[PDB]
Amino acid sequence: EPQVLCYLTSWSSKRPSAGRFMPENVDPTLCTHVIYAFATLKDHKLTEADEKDADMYDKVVALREKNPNLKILLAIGGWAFGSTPFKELTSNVFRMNQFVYEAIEFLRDYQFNGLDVDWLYPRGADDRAAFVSLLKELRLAFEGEAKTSGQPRLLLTAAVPASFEAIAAGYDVPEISKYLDFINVMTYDFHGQWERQVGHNSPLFPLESATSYQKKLTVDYSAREWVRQGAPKEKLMIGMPTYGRSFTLINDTQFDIGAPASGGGQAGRFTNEAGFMSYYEICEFLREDNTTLVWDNEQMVPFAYREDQWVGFDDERSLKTKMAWLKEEGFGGIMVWSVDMDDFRGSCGTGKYPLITAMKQELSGYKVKL
Numbered sequence: 001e002p003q004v005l006c007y008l009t010s011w012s013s014k015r016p017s018a019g020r021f022m023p024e025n026v027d028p029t030l031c032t033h034v035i036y037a038f039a040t041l042k043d044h045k046l047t048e049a050d051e052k053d054a055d056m057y058d059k060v061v062a063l064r065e066k067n068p069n070l071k072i073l074l075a076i077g078g079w080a081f082g083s084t085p086f087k088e089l090t091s092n093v094f095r096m097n098q099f100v101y102e103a104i105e106f107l108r109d110y111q112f113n114g115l116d117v118d119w120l121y122p123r124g125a126d127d128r129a130a131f132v133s134l135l136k137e138l139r140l141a142f143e144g145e146a147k148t149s150g151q152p153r154l155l156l157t158a159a160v161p162a163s164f165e166a167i168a169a170g171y172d173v174p175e176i177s178k179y180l181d182f183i184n185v186m187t188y189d190f191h192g193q194w195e196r197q198v199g200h201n202s203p204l205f206p207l208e209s210a211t212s213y214q215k216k217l218t219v220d221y222s223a224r225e226w227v228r229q230g231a232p233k234e235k236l237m238i239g240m241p242t243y244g245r246s247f248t249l250i251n252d253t254q255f256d257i258g259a260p261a262s263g264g265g266q267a268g269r270f271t272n273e274a275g276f277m278s279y280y281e282i283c284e285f286l287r288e289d290n291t292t293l294v295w296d297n298e299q300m301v302p303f304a305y306r307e308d309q310w311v312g313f314d315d316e317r318s319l320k321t322k323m324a325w326l327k328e329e330g331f332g333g334i335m336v337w338s339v340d341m342d343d344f345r346g347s348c349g350t351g352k353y354p355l356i357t358a359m360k361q362e363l364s365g366y367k368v369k370l
């Protein structure tokens with residue numbers, strides 16, 4: 001029963017032209033869960049991050065109206081949110097607990113199936129405990145709300161980093177595994193525009209060339225590191241990106257892995273952030289005159305370059321290769337960032353939703369067992 005958790009970004013509705021994505025562009029039979037990103041905290045209380053995000057929460061739910069087994073979650077936090085609103089939330093108990101109690105109310109008001117807690121990232125010994133405390137009080141209050149109210153319990157999931165260094169620094173893995181329904185490993189952003197050398201967003205395996213250090217910055221090593229630190233395989237949802245990480249090359253003749261980069265690459269027309277492109281933006285890039293598509297047979301992922309623009313991404317083949325690895329490793333399913341950056345319109349010339357469809361196909365008939 002492999003689970004497929006799909007993140008829906010709220011800000012995708014603000015995209016121009018075709019890029020614009022709304023909750024009813026979602027194929028309600030694709031994913032097993034849809035997670036809406038993100039909400040915020042208004043004085044340590046879970047709330048809408050924008051005034052008529054509200055009607056969107058209502059639109060993203062009632063995807064259930066056409067798939068009643070579909071679970072809809074609300075996400076809190078994310079990258080831009082930072083760590084500060086979480087240290088505050090968890091600095092004292094009345095604050096944290098009244099957040100829990102009121103979040104349930106909030107969640108039930110909108111008829112969300114659960115909460116995805118995305119604190120990026122706890123660091124150090126007291127952040128470690130605050131994170132476990134937060135997860136414990138929420139999970140326990142959820143359990144205890146189900147038997148006072150008599151409804152199916154609210155779900156508790158959390159997104160977690162890939163880096164082994166990040167795991168040690170902020171994550172008591174046996175403890176959070178205990179309270180989380182689902183552990184969403186963000187096995188992407190291994191390399192990107194913060195770096196001055198070309199590297200791939202999401203390599204499954206490393207180059208044989210690689211330093212022992214970077215042999216660790218792979219989907220395979222990361223997911224396994226989590227298993228090593230206590231994580232139950234059936235709760236491990238391995239992250240799958242539908243975007244690629246792009247670079248501007250210092251020199252056009254140097255396009256290989258490790259090639260010097262001045263920084264991020266040209267923003268896509270619709271996502272408007274230099275450093276990455278959606279998959280439908282990748283497709284246009286591929287269609288352009290003399291773009292060179294390269295398959296990395298060691299890393300099992302593709303990248304492509306034209307002139308001084310270089311992008312490493314996931315396609316149908318690499319994602320299926322990862323599904324074969326995941327079934328072989330016995331993981332409980334996948335997490336997708338994000339449903340709105342897959343080619344949902346089918347403009348790439350393949351099917352509609354070609355990336356998530358590919359992963360679905362390869363997961364068919366897979367039962368996770370122990």
Ligand SMILES: CC(=O)N[C@@H]1[C@@H](O)[C@H](O[C@@H]2O[C@H](CO)[C@@H](O[C@@H]3O[C@H](CO)[C@@H](O[C@@H]4O[C@H](CO)[C@@H](O[C@@H]5O[C@H](CO)[C@@H](O)[C@H](O)[C@H]5NC(C)=O)[C@H](O)[C@H]4NC(C)=O)[C@H](O)[C@H]3NC(C)=O)[C@H](O)[C@H]2NC(C)=O)[C@@H](CO)O[C@H]1O
Binds near residue numbers: 272
């Ligand atoms: C090996 C190692 O240590 N590597 C790290 C590397 O991990 C670090 O990169 C960061 O990784 C984390 C995952 O661990 C990324 O956060 C995840 O993944 C999602 C995709 O990257 C991320 O989506 C981003 O969310 C932002 C909001 O928090 C989006 O900002 C939005 O930008 C829009 C313009 O483009 C704007 O209109 C919106 O208003 C704005 N939204 C908000 C709320 O402000 C951003 O666009 C989006 N990126 C996308 C969609 O591609 C999620 O936040 C998060 N998912 C979760 C929590 O479930 C994070 O993105 C990575 N950071 C960067 C800068 O790439 C890296 C950082 O330097 O360090 C390495 O060492």
Ligand SMILES: *[C@@H]1O[C@H](CO)[C@@H](O)[C@H](O)[C@H]1NC(C)=O
Binds near residue numbers: 252253254
């Ligand atoms: C690009 O790199 C080559 C070496 O591969 C070098 O000879 C050339 O001068 C460079 N071109 C520039 C910096 O414009």
